[PDB]
Design a protein around this ligand. Structure first.
Ligand code: A1L6J
Ligand code: A1L6J
Lengths: 252, 249
């Protein structure tokens, strides 16, 4: 999965955190052509066994990992997506000079894309643990792919808040919240509630409120993702068919 | 985007072929701006998508003017005393025009054009007439892409009428060659009618006399026979930016 550092050219920073940075880049490929890539520098064992596991995944709704470079500090190489992240994209759509006003059907498709990507990952028993709109990338064909920047109390399941166990249902809970971000076009979860009040708020039985123009059927699906008992929440494959059927029931 | 005709005063001709004239544009803040006015609902269509663009390397649109004189539409652009890049390059080879352009400045010229093209490529907008003559020099010597030619058309676009963003990349390679050659017409010794045959037999523009091998590599990649093998504007922009940083100041 390793790529020779020679074939990589680094550009300007695209985003910066504290556990690493992400920079644009040029990747020289096998067929001579160059490809625009993103380079997340995570400035190791659990990583080597991970990038190998992820470089073998292949799904259109899962971000594709092009490989890893070794500098003497590892760097992850991913294809550059001009459209950015779904969260920032949603906010832009509420503005006159950005993406056109995203209709209901396009928003639902966004959710379908994510559910497909998560179904694929949960089928291989992979735990994302950081699902959110900010971690979803828009491909060049406007299809959304699941990713994880890695460089969120309101996106964490109730059982994961008190205990520290994470499961496929924890990801499903975060999926419901992501579904709510999309339906709200970028709103922060639980307006009027502080991060420290989140566990108390959830333990008393409170959940995210139904968006303004969100269909009842759509809210039913996302609400199911927040059932107090993880075993009562539906699987990603179940969620994928529910969303796909709802989207089909809507006019083109 | 329309602007009251009474706010525009036309001057002398800056170049013809429609015609472009200098002009004074009274602004909303009371002051007048030195503008360029080009005269010929398909003309308004080109400018429809123009007022949306906002990039320092893309010529900015000031407005559109409909003259009912006797319609006659007119586009208003900011006036650039330094003219077009192609003519500017020729002037550089004369002792009364701008001084000899160093390699770094020539590279920055390409970098500016690449940023402009990258901006419009991300917007899925095809230029289709990219050349040094269609590039304008701003007051701060930065280059901006504009549009006022058989040798600037990609080989896939000569046979068919197909025009992709890779075709713009092909024309970008030719433009890079123009800047490196400081105004030489592409393909010396080759006629316009011989261009398609010339390209079909694997021949490409020749490497300039004082063109660094790295630079020629980048522009050669723009002329690959398969459009899918030509790099994108974003990749090209980084390649030029990296080449420029490696050279001393
Ligand atoms: C106009 N504009 C466009 C972009 C822009 O374009 C981009 N193109 C590509 N990447 C970009 O940033 C990414 C970098 C790395 C990763 N991901 C990894 O490094 C991962 C390693 N693993 C193992 N996984 C994983 C985990 C779990 C799974 F289930 C599946 C995979 C990873 O996701 C994802 C995105 C950007 C940005 C970008 C960069 C910074 C901030 C923002 N806001 C956007 C900025 N501005
Ligand atoms: C000392 N001296 C200075 C100048 C001089 O100064 C100037 N200042 C400003 N403009 C000038 O001429 C222009 C007129 C129109 C346009 N362009 C449009 O009207 C466009 C419509 N569209 C849709 N687009 C488009 C397309 C695709 C995109 F991606 C983006 C935009 C246009 O660009 C561009 C230049 C001149 C000249 C000038 C004028 C004529 C000939 C020459 N040789 C120079 C002469 N002598």
């Amino acid at each position: 999965v390793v790529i020779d550092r020679n074939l990589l050219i680094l550009g300007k920073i695209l985003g910066e955190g504290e556990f690493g940075s992400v920079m644009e880049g040029n990747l020289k490929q096998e067929d001579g052509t160059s490809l625009k890539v993103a380079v997340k520098t995570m400035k190791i064992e659990e990583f080597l066994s991970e990038a190998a596991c992820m470089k073998d995944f292949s799904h259109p709704n899962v971000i594709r990992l092009l490989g890893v470079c070794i500098e003497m500090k590892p760097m992850v190489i991913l294809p550059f997506m001009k459209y950015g992240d779904l969260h920032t994209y949603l906010l832009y759509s509420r503005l006159e000079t950005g993406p056109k006003h995203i209709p209901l059907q396009t928003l639902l498709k966004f959710m379908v894309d994510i559910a497909l990507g998560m179904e694929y990952l949960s089928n291989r028993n992979f735990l994302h643990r950081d699902l959110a709109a900010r971690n979803c990338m828009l491909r060049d064909d406007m299809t959304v792919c699941v990713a994880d920047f890695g460089l969120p109390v309101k996106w964490i399941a109730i059982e994961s808040l008190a205990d520290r166990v994470y499961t496929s249902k924890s990801d499903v809970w975060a999926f419901g919240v992501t579904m709510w971000e999309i339906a709200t076009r970028g709103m922060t979860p639980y307006p009027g509630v502080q991060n420290h009040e989140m566990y108390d708020y959830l333990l008393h039985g409170h959940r995210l409120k139904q968006p303004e123009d969100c269909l009842d059927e759509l809210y039913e699906i996302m609400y199911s993702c927040w059932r107090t008992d993880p075993l009562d929440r539906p699987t990603f494959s179940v969620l994928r068919l529910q969303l796909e059927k709802l989207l089909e029931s809507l006019p083109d």
